[PDB]
């Protein structure tokens, strides 16, 4: 194997090597030093006189006399297989769960190709996450990109793990009748700590969710370039499964802010001049190359749904990261610090949340046909309840009209029975039941969004099940 | 012709080597895989190239070839019913070639080189020709596609090809000095195609929507701008404007849209739309689809490609309507391109030439006398979508200074079931005074005064709402009650329009004039009555109301009779008040 | 409300101005490192 000696420079993350015309741009190399310890590096610049290499590790043993550089691969690839389901990987594709490496059905470039616009089709069917404020009011449709806007201290890892081990597709509600479409979850974690890593492993092992999952876990002190490669490997596996084996895939990307920070550090390490607010000038197109490889294609039966989780840096929805993410994706689910400190889990605020494709995935043939109007009615009632709850502090309840006390009690029971669901796994029917039992508090005729048929059909139930059962 | 090697791959689409003959902003072929890129800086022997796709896998020593010509489009027969990307690449043939993905370095020609067209000459040997003159004819999806001399060509005919049936490449006319004219030519997308003279904005662009055509019109060759809030039904408005207007050809430009742009462009247009007269609407429109993760060069050039195609169809003698899906997503790509060249930002990061580029786009609109002596026009309707609806960003400010009309869609209206959800308070237009004569001569001698009167009623009813919020409607006087009621009647029987009703989908100018005149007459009568001593309650239950509010759904033929008899009925019910 | 909006737009102006200054400086130092690495080549 051809070895390249002739290092001329070592500083920080870079090192220059001479007489290296035969290294392709973007290639992956390895760096063997005087003690024989082998590191890894990527070629970020090549010309006639020398090549620049970014070492993704520390450089504390290197010298200009014993170091050598050798090629391992011309472009970054990933060996995929259908027997990855159940395995854990570190974020550049190496196993960390103590099992043998896999044998690939093929090797794929992790920086995949863009989808052709005339090949997609309109997303049509929904996914049951088991959480009522998401299913009923912000339904997730197969092929959508729905991000979760979290905070600094809010529990987004718990919500991620719960959605991961609860999600399913419901073929019986549609005409399909029988369960023959497979479901898979791909779980990419970026810059997590050891505490969170222990939590995730324990959660995926204690309930058998691992049997249908792939995990790409990337710790906080690992090389940053691995943090850059993690989501691309995840989405490569997802696209392969979906469009070669008809799987329905659900991809979760745990902290896109960690990704953006790594991207900024790398861009600065190559001496690029940044853009607005200090982030790279090309962050929009980068995030787009990640998010936009998701959807449903025409003539195929698989699908790729995507739920990027990110924590708004300073609770600021105008920071570049949530800003661009909102430009690209189709809605957002907004966690709230108030509901969190009030002891509610999961702390989802229905008022600033929104699913943009929801209307094309609900109704008869897809879900129960009262879904849309019940959603709108719950929204309006909760808004009125919140306003009245604010006014009753300066007026006092005795000076309120009757419908107002109705709305007050409604909003209270709403956030105590609908939102605060704990670790229960609610179907869609249980959620619609609870919604109707809550709407039954308001007087009939106040529900001016719903049509009369459904009001006759479902009104009148009272809170029975949520306290008659766990 | 010029050819070199690679000297340095500095990273993301940045190359160099010795190519002394090469010229600025030429299109080049990088590597062996043939990646395309544009030359941005010449130095000594070397030249800097900006590749479009990613360069991972390239190495130094590979060849670099320069085509010798800047970014260009192919203007000829075969573009209608077609779906292109931002640089005129046929997406359908790409798919048929390489599947559901777009592999890098794929090569396809915009015009199908194999299809045969039925040529029909219109010159004979010895004829002098200049730039822009007609040359022949080809039938295409139901209209004669003329064949035009390129705008910079001049000579005398030597020979013409007989009627027959040829391909696009066949040289159908050979000029004397030796140059051959094919069925198509090419044009740099960054140069405005020349014309004789620009005419004035004195003829209206008819949309078929009452509010846009009456309260805020645009002239032939004018420009408007609409914002893009969610839930306001922008797509339905755009489709109605596409299918009902008096434009012969439609060009739709979707630049940098969300992944789900098909859901309302590529699955809707081909089927869910039919013209007034025939089959598919797609037989007279050119789509330019461009999602978010396409290369930035394509997303930035999409606007210019679209406007050049529209200028072609105008120079041919039609009247074109061009719509930009989101110019904010285009300004984003512009900012990114600028940041790669390390320029100083002006405000909010945007380069200091944002306004110049925006004007260089919008100023190609207009009605002209073509080089061939015909008349044609291009009307632009471009959408702007700020971050959180703030009209103070630099893109919106730069736009509003050069457009002629602002149609303010608003979600709060579609929340209360008002369609189309155009806010009549924030909207405006600047073409009304210039358009008045055409109105007097083609609609009615008093049309402008009725339009101002309706505007004034709406203005008063708006300036009255706060006192209605404070106490409620029943607590007001008789005159204030009357103006509230007549304002509701206006904005529920004249402004509002149902795009799916097979009769209310369209409306003429005379139909709208009739409705306005009906309402003004009714209001004059009612004012006289309540001044006389009738209560507003006898008035609200008058039977003439359910006919003045039903006048939308009557056909365009049965409307003159309906109108005259409804006017007589309005006269009658007043006598019972007298 | 007008007073708060005034304060906000003022703060935003100052922040953008500082950002512009420091990007100017960054461009300068990059040009410098390239020049003085090439002159030593």
UniProtKB/Swiss-Prot annotation, chain A:
Pfam families per the record? ATP-synt_ab, ATP-synt_ab_N, ATP-synt_VA_C
Keyword Transport part of the UniProt annotation? yes
Q: What is the top-level taxon of the source organism? A: Bacteria
Q: What keywords sit in the KW lines? A: ATP synthesis, Hydrogen ion transport, Ion transport, Transport
- SUPFAM superfamilies per the UniProt record, alphabetical: C-terminal domain of alpha and beta subunits of F1 ATP synthase, P-loop containing nucleoside triphosphate hydrolases
Q: Give the UniProt record's GO annotations in the biological process aspect.
A: proton motive force-driven plasma membrane ATP synthesis
User: GO molecular function, one example?
Assistant: ATP binding
Q: What protein family is recorded?
A: Belongs to the ATPase alpha/beta chains family.
Matching entries from NCBIfam families are given as:
PRK04196.1
Q: What does this protein do?
A: Produces ATP from ADP in the presence of a proton gradient across the membrane. The V-type beta chain is a regulatory subunit.
Q: What is this protein called?
A: V-type ATP synthase beta chain
Q: What is the primary gene name for this protein?
A: atpB
Curated annotation (Swiss-Prot), chain B:
Its GO CC terms are: proton-transporting ATP synthase complex
Q: Where, by residue number, does ATP bind?
A: 228-235
Relate the protein's function as given in its record: Produces ATP from ADP in the presence of a proton gradient across the membrane. The V-type alpha chain is a catalytic subunit.
Q: Name one GO molecular function term.
A: proton-transporting ATPase activity, rotational mechanism
The record's listing under Pfam families reads: ATP-synt_ab (PF00006), ATP-synt_ab_N (PF02874), ATP-synt_ab_Xtn (PF16886), ATP-synt_VA_C (PF22919)
Query: Which domain of life does the UniProt lineage start with?
Result: Bacteria
Q: What family classification does the UniProt entry report for this protein? A: Belongs to the ATPase alpha/beta chains family.
Stretches assigned to coiled coil: none
Q: Which InterPro entries match?
A: ATP-synt_VA_C, ATP-synth_a_Xtn, ATP_synth_asu-like_sf, ATPase_a/bsu_AS, ATPase_F1/V1/A1_a/bsu_N, ATPase_F1/V1/A1_a/bsu_N_sf, ATPase_F1/V1/A1_a/bsu_nucl-bd, ATPase_F1/V1_b/a_C
Q: Which SUPFAM superfamilies match?
A: C-terminal domain of alpha and beta subunits of F1 ATP synthase (SSF47917), N-terminal domain of alpha and beta subunits of F1 ATP synthase (SSF50615), P-loop containing nucleoside triphosphate hydrolases (SSF52540)
Secretion signal: which residues?
none
Q: Which reaction does it catalyse?
A: ATP + H2O + 4 H(+)(in) = ADP + phosphate + 5 H(+)(out)
Q: Any idea what this protein is called?
A: V-type ATP synthase alpha chain
Q: Which UniProt keywords apply?
A: ATP synthesis, ATP-binding, Hydrogen ion transport, Ion transport, Nucleotide-binding, Translocase, Transport
> What's its top-level EC category?
translocase
Protein's organism: Thermus thermophilus (strain ATCC 27634 / DSM 579 / HB8)
EC numbers listed for it are 7.1.2.2
Swiss-Prot record, chain C:
Lineage, top-rank taxon, reads Bacteria
Task of the protein: Produces ATP from ADP in the presence of a proton gradient across the membrane.
Section of the entire sequence shown: 169 to 209 of 223
Q: What is this protein called?
A: V-type ATP synthase subunit D
Family per record: Belongs to the V-ATPase D subunit family.
């Amino acid at each position: 194997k051809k070895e390249y000696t002739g290092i001329t420079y070592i500083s920080g993350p870079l090192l220059f090597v001479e007489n290296a015309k035969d290294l392709a741009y973007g290639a992956i190399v390895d760096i063997k030093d005087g003690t024989g310890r082998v590191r890894g590096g990527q070629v970020i610049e090549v010309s006639e006189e020398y090549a620049v290499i970014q070492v993704f590790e520390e450089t504390t043993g290197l010298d200009l006399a014993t170091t050598s550089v050798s090629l391992v691969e011309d472009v970054a690839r990933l060996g995929v297989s259908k027997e990855m389901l159940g395995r854990r990987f570190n974020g550049i594709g190496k196993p960390i769960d103590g099992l043998p490496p896999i044998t690939p059905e093929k090797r794929l470039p992790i920086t995949g190709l863009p989808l052709n616009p005339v090949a997609r089709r309109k997303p049509e069917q929904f996914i049951q996450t088991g959480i009522s404020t998401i299913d009923v009011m912000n339904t997730l449709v197969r092929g959508q990109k729905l991000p979760i806007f979290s905070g600094s201290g809010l529990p987004a890892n718990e919500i991620a793990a719960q959605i991961a081990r609860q999600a399913t597709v419901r073929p019986d509600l549609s005409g399909e009748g029988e369960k023959e479409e497979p479901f898979a979850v791909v779980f990419a974690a970026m810059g997590i700590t050891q505490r969170e890593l222990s939590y995730f492993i324990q959660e995926f092992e204690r309930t058998g969710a691992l049997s249908r999952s792939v995990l790409f876990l990337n710790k906080a002190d690992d090389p940053t370039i691995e943090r850059i490669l993690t989501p691309r490997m995840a989405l490569t596996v997802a696209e392969y499964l979906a469009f070669e084996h008809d799987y329905h895939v659900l991809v979760i990307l745990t902290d896109m802010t960690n990704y953006c920070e790594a991207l900024r550090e790398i861009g600065a390490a190559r001496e690029e001049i940044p853009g607005r607010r200090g982030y790279p000038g090309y962050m929009y197109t980068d995030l787009a190359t990640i998010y936009e490889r998701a959807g449903v294609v025409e003539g195929k039966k698989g699908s790729v749904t995507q739920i990027p989780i990110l924590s708004m840096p300073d609770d600021d929805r105008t920071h570049p990261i949530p800003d661009l993410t909102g430009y690209i994706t189709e809605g957002q689910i907004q966690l709230s610090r108030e509901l969190h400190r009030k002891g509610i889990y999961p702390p989802i605020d229905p008022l600033p949340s929104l699913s943009r494709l929801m209307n094309n995935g609900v109704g008869k043939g897809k879900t129960r046909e009262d879904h849309k109007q019940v959603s709108d009615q719950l929204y309006s009632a909760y808004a009125n309840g919140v306003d009245i709850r604010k006014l009753v502090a300066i007026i006092g309840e005795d000076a309120l009209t009757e419908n107002d006390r109705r709305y007050l009690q409604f909003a209270d029971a709403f956030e105590r029975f609908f939102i605060n669901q704990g670790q229960q796994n609610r179907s869609i029917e249980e959620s619609l039941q609870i919604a109707w039992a809550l709407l039954s508090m308001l007087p009939q005729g106040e529900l001016k969004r719903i049509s009369k048929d459904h009001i006759g059909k479902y009104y009148g139930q009272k809170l029975e099940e949520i306290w008659g059962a766990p | 012709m010029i050819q070199g090697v690679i000297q340095k791959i500095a990273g993301p689409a940045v190359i160099a080597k010795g190519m002394l003959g090469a010229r600025m902003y030429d299109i080049c072929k990088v590597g062996e895989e043939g990646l395309v890129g544009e030359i941005i800086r010449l130095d000594g022997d070397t030249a800097f190239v900006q590749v479009y796709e990613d360069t991972s896998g390239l190495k130094v020593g590979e060849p670099v070839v320069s085509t010798g010509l800047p970014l260009a489009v192919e203007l000829g027969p075969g573009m209608l019913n077609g779906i292109y990307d931002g640089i005129q690449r046929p997406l359908e043939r790409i798919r048929e070639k390489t599947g559901i993905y777009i592999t890098r370095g794929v090569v396809v020609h915009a015009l199908d080189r194999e299809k045969k067209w039925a040529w029909t000459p219109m010159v004979k040997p010895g004829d002098e020709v200049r730039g822009g003159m007609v040359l022949g004819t080809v039938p295409e999806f139901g209209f004669t596609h003329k064949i035009l001399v390129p705008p910079d060509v001049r000579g005398r005919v030597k020979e013409v090809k007989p009627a027959g049936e040829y391909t696009v490449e066949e040289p159908v006319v050979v000029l004397e000095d030796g140059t051959e004219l094919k069925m198509y030519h090419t044009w740099p997308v960054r140069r405005a195609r020349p014309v004789q003279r620009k005419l004035d904005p004195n003829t209206p662009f008819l949309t078929g929507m009452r509010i846009l055509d009456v309260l805020f019109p645009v002239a032939m060759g004018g420009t408007a701008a609409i914002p893009g809030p969610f839930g306001a039904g922008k797509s339905v408005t755009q489709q109605s404007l596409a299918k009902w207007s008096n434009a012969d050809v439609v060009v739709y430009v979707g630049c940098g849209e969300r992944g789900n742009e098909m859901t309302d462009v590529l699955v809707e247009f081909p089927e869910l739309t039919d013209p007034k007269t025939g089959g598919p609407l797609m037989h007279r429109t050119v789509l330019i689809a461009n999602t978010s993760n396409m290369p930035v060069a394509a997303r930035e050039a999409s606007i210019y490609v679209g406007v050049t195609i529209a200028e072609y169809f105008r120079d041919q003698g039609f009247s074109v309507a061009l719509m930009a899906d989101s110019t904010s997503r285009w300004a984003e790509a512009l900012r990114e391109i600028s940041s790669r060249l390390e320029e100083m930002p002006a405000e909010e990061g945007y380069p200091p030439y944002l306004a110049a580029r925006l004007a260089a786009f919008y100023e190609r609109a207009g009605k002209v006398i073509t080089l061939g002596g015909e008349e044609g026009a291009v009307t632009i309707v471009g959408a702007v979508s700020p971050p959180g609806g703030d009209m103070s960003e630099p893109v919106t400010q730069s736009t509003l200074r050069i457009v002629g009309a602002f149609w303010r869609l608003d979600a709060s209206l579609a929340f209360r079931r008002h369609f189309p959800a155009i806010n009549w308070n924030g909207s405006y237009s600047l073409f009304t005074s210039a358009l008045d004569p055409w109105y007097r001569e083609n609609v009615a001698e008093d049309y402008p005064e009725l339009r101002d009167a309706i505007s004034e009623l709406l203005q008063r009813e708006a300036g009255l709402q706060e006192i209605v919020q404070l106490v409620g409607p029943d607590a007001l006087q008789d005159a204030e009650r009357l103006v509230i009621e007549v304002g509701r009647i206006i904005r529920e029987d004249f402004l509002q329009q149902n795009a799916y009703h097979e009769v209310d989908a369209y409306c003429s100018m005379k139909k709208a004039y009739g409705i306005m005149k009906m309402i003004l007459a009714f209001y004059k009568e009612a004012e006289a009555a309540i001044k006389r001593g009738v209560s507003i309650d006898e008035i609200l239950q008058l039977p003439v109301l359910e006919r003045i509010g039903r006048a939308r759904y009557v056909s365009e033929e049965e409307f003159p009779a309906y109108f005259e008899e409804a006017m007589k009925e309005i006269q009658g019910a007043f006598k019972a008040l007298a | 409300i007008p007073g708060i909006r005034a304060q906000i737009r003022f703060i935003q102006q100052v922040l953008e101005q500082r950002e512009r200054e420091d990007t100017f400086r960054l461009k300068r130092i990059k040009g410098k490192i390239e020049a003085r690495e090439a002159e030593e080549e």
